[PDB]
């Protein structure tokens, strides 16, 4: 368990872009998850993403 500090993905960033105005109403489309560094196989992942429910 070393991934409860996810808010850091906007902490040192928004410090330079939110301090002026209320532009948060515009950043709804930003995804919570980031992009990682690995090659995704076409078929190995669909089972694990459909097995959640």
């Amino acid at each position: 368990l070393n991934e409860l500090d996810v808010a850091n993905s906007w902490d040192k960033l928004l410090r330079m872009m939110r301090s002026e105005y209320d532009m948060s109403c515009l950043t709804s489309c930003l995804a919570r998850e980031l992009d990682e560094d690995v090659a995704w196989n076409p078929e190995m992942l669909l089972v694990q993403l459909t097995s959640d429910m």
Binding site: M23, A31, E33, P42
Partner: protein
Amino acid sequence: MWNRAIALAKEHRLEDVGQLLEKYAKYLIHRERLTEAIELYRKAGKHDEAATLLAQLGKRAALRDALKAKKFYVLSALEVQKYRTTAIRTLDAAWRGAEAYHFLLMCQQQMADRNFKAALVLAMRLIEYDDLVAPVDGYSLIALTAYLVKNFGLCSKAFARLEQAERNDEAPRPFADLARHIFMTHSPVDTSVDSVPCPTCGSFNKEWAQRCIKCQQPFNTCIVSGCAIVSEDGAWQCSVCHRKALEAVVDKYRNCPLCHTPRKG
């Protein structure tokens, strides 16, 4: 015994197998067994309506969390590519649908990559893709990255379209507030946008331009940076997903941003 039923109908020339396969597909849809349905489709060699039925749940996944939707489109493109080997308008429309959700991921994570210059180049490529992704989604990012690099002009067009959408919706909106606040607290003039010349006629065009403004020749766009390629020497062509990128950025990535094809050695 659907597996037995299809074999029984095939060996007795019961050409009505289409209705049986439709019933099986509907039953697996009701039991939400997409894995069983796609395995049945790939063992049966069905490509196009199979990809369509995959995309039916693809957009339902996309409307809330689409990092799986892009994967759905990727393997749909893989299925229509395997159709060529299975053989021995829709040829490029499937690839258009697959590439429709290419740009958004790196456009959003470009802020994390901190190189905000390429973020606008990525963001101004989804204008033609307003059918697959609603323009209210993309224009927010377009205006956001226009502000973050302190440039304007395109942000004015994005805010205008967004506010027209809002006025269509209400018939209390904060994007009008944002547009007015930015336009009065900053100079709303477009910066330099023509920085690449056409390789054919020498005409300077937009970095996000899909065609020349003078000779009307389409350019292949970079798959990660989004800039239109002018010289084939610095153009890297992928042999699997049939896409092109720039050498200076694709040298950093050991795998393709679309297919992640391993390099043969």
